[PDB]
C-alpha cells in the first residue's frame, strides 16, 4: 500500500503556521523520488539524507507537517534559524533528518479583499522547542498589570493575520510548506520504499 502523501500535499486547505498540522505516516510504502519529480516545488531541500537514498532506507514512523507562511519566511523553516516563524511558530531541531518542501500558493490562498484567515504568533516570551505547537490565544502580557482577557495597552492579542492578496510581492505571497520528519524508533520499521 502506497503512503497517503496526496492527502497532505494536495489538500484543499492548509493550516496556519501557529497551529500546524501533523500527519503520522505508518505501515506503508513511499516513493520519495516520485514526490521530488513534481517540477512544481520551489523548495525541496533535504537535510541529512537524499531523496534517492530515502527510497532505500526504512523508518518506524514518518511525520508530514504542513502550514502556510509568507514567501520571505520559508528560509526560517530550516535548522539553525531564528525569526518570528522559527521562534514562535514552527521550530526545527538543529539535528534534523528530513525534507522541507514548499511551493507558491498565491492562486489558492490569496483572495480579493485580502485573505485574512492564515495567522502567525507575533508575541511569545520564549522560543518554541523543536516540534512544539503553541495554540494559546490568551492575551500577551507586556507589562506588570494583569490583562484579564482584555486587549489594551501592554496587553496584546498574540496572533496576527497574514494579508494574502493576489498582487502581493512574492515575499508577501502565501507558500504552502510540508516538512517530512524521518524516525528510527527502537520498534519495527514500517515505512519503506
Amino acid at each position: 500500500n502506497l503512503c497517503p502523501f496526496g492527502e497532505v500535499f494536495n489538500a484543499t486547505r492548509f493550516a496556519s503556521v501557529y497551529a500546524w498540522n501533523r500527519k503520522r505516516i505508518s505501515n506503508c510504502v513511499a516513493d520519495y523520488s516520485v514526490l521530488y519529480n513534481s517540477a512544481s516545488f520551489s523548495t525541496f531541500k533535504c537535510y541529512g539524507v537524499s531523496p534517492t537514498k530515502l527510497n532505500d532506507l526504512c523508518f518506524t514512523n514518518v511525520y508530514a507537517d504542513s502550514f502556510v507562511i509568507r514567501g520571505d519566511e520559508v528560509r526560517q523553516i530550516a535548522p539553525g534559524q531564528t525569526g518570528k516563524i522559527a521562534d514562535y511558530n514552527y521550530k526545527l531541531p538543529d539535528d534534523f533528518t528530513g525534507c522541507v518542501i514548499a511551493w507558491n500558493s498565491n492562486n489558492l490562498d490569496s483572495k480579493v479583499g485580502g485573505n485574512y484567515n492564515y495567522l502567525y504568533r507575533l508575541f511569545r516570551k520564549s522560543n518554541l522547542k523543536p516540534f512544539e505547537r503553541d495554540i494559546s490565544t490568551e492575551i500577551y502580557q507586556a507589562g506588570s498589570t494583569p490583562c484579564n482577557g482584555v486587549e489594551g495597552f501592554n496587553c496584546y492579542f498574540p496572533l496576527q493575520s497574514y494579508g494574502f492578496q493576489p498582487t502581493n510581492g512574492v515575499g508577501y505571497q502565501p507558500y504552502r510548506v510540508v516538512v517530512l520528519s524521518f524516525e528510527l524508533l527502537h520498534a519495527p520499521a514500517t515505512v519503506c520504499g
Partner: antibody, heavy 114, light 108 residues
Framework: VQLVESGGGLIQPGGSLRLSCVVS????????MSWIRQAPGKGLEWVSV???????FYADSVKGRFTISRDSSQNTLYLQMNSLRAEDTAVYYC?????????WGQGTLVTVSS | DIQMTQSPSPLSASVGDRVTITCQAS??????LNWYQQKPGKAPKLLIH???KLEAGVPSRFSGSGSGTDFTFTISSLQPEDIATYYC?????????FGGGTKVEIKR
C-alpha cells in the same frame, strides 16, 4: 511610559562603550526593542533589535561589533559597542520599536574621535 | 535591503495649504509603513502607523495613504508648528529602513 538612554560621550576610535536604556511602563524582557541612531545632520538608521523571546538581529554596518542585550532585574536594555569607528558617531535611541505599542527615548550622543 | 525614497529634500507651503510627501518602496511592504515627525532638536515622533492609522493625540490634519510600494503623507492645513523633518519607515521586513527625510517649511 518612559525610556531613558545613558552611557554616551567621547571615545577614541577602536574603543568600547555600553549604552543603557532604563524602562518604566513595560517589561523589557517581554517586548520587541530596537536601537536606532541618527548621525549629526543626517537621518535615522536602524542598528539592532531584540525579539520578545530573545533572538537578536543587527544592521550590516554593526555586525561583529555591536551586541544588544537586556536585564530583567533592572528593566534595562543595553548596547555594547566595540571597535568603534567615526561613522558610529550619532545620537542613539532605544524603542519598543517594531511590534508593540510605540515608545522612543530622548537619545544619548556618542562621539567617536581622536 | 528595502530602500525607501522620499519626496526629495525641502518642501514648502503657506500656512493653511496642503503638503504632500511621497514615499516609494523598493519592493512590496504591504501597509507596514510608519511615518515619523521630527521637530528640530527633538526625538522622532510616530504620527501614522500602518500606512493610514493615526496615533493617539495626533491632530486631524495629518493623514496617510498608500499600499504596496507607493505611499503619501498629507497635512491638510499646514501650521507654523508643523515645521519638521518627516520620515517614512518600513518595519516588518528586516534591515529596518527609513526614508532619507523630507524637511517641510512655511512660506511666509
Amino acid at each position: 511610559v518612559q525610556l531613558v538612554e545613558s552611557g554616551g560621550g567621547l571615545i577614541q576610535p577602536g574603543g568600547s562603550l555600553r549604552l543603557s536604556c532604563v524602562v518604566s511602563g513595560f517589561t523589557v524582557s517581554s517586548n520587541y526593542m530596537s536601537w536606532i541612531r541618527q548621525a549629526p545632520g543626517k537621518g535615522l538608521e536602524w542598528v539592532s533589535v531584540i525579539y520578545s523571546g530573545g533572538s537578536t538581529f543587527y544592521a550590516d554596518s554593526v555586525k561583529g561589533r555591536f551586541t544588544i542585550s537586556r536585564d530583567s532585574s533592572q528593566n534595562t536594555l543595553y548596547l555594547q559597542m566595540n571597535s568603534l569607528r567615526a561613522e558610529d558617531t550619532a545620537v542613539y535611541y532605544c524603542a519598543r520599536h517594531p511590534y508593540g505599542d510605540h515608545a522612543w527615548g530622548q537619545g544619548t550622543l556618542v562621539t567617536v574621535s581622536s | 535591503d528595502i530602500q525607501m525614497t522620499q519626496s526629495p529634500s525641502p518642501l514648502s507651503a503657506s500656512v493653511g495649504d496642503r503638503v504632500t510627501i511621497t514615499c516609494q518602496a523598493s519592493q512590496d511592504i504591504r501597509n507596514f509603513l510608519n511615518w515619523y515627525q521630527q521637530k528640530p532638536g527633538k526625538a522622532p515622533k510616530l504620527l501614522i502607523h500602518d500606512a493610514s492609522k493615526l496615533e493617539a493625540g495626533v491632530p486631524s490634519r495629518f493623514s496617510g495613504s498608500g499600499s504596496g510600494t507607493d505611499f503619501t503623507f498629507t497635512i491638510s492645513s499646514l501650521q507654523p508648528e508643523d515645521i519638521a523633518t518627516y520620515y517614512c519607515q518600513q518595519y516588518d521586513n528586516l534591515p529596518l529602513t527609513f526614508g532619507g527625510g523630507t524637511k517641510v517649511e512655511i512660506k511666509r
